[PDB]
Amino acid sequence: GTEFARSEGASALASVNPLKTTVEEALSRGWSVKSGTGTEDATKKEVPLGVAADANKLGTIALKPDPADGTADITLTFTMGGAGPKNKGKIITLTRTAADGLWKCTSDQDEQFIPKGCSR
């Protein structure tokens, strides 16, 4: 009824959207990306995303595959387990397709709370 449903969606997207850059910069070096926080590992040539899975209390951030080397499709998901009733259990998915390097955003939210630039 009084849930902040549109702001929840915007907050979730804002937690994962910046990670596109992180991913591209790693792949441009020929390094892999791995989930979580920490330091670059020059032995395995892995760069962490730099963000904790629970950085945003609306939900959880995940990367697949983990680690990711750019030779397969990458997905970054925000799973809204901490959200109010309209958005609880919904998932925003950013996918980078390996064949062309393009990103897309899809959500299974109700259409009216899907953030700008994302589709069903």
Curated annotation (Swiss-Prot):
Membrane topology type: Single-pass membrane protein
- Per the UniProt entry, the disulfide pairs are C105-C118
Gene Ontology terms, cellular component aspect?
Answer: membrane; type IV pilus
Where would you find this protein in the cell? Fimbrium; Membrane
Q: Which UniProt keywords apply?
A: Disulfide bond, Fimbrium, Membrane, Methylation, Transmembrane, Transmembrane helix
Single biological process term from Gene Ontology: type IV pilus-dependent motility
What family does the Swiss-Prot or TrEMBL record give for this protein? Belongs to the N-Me-Phe pilin family.
Q: How does it assemble?
A: The pili are polar flexible filaments of about 5.4 nanometers diameter and 2.5 micrometers average length; they consist of only a single polypeptide chain arranged in a helical configuration of five subunits per turn in the assembled pilus.
This chain belongs to which protein, by name? Fimbrial protein
Provenance organism: Pseudomonas aeruginosa
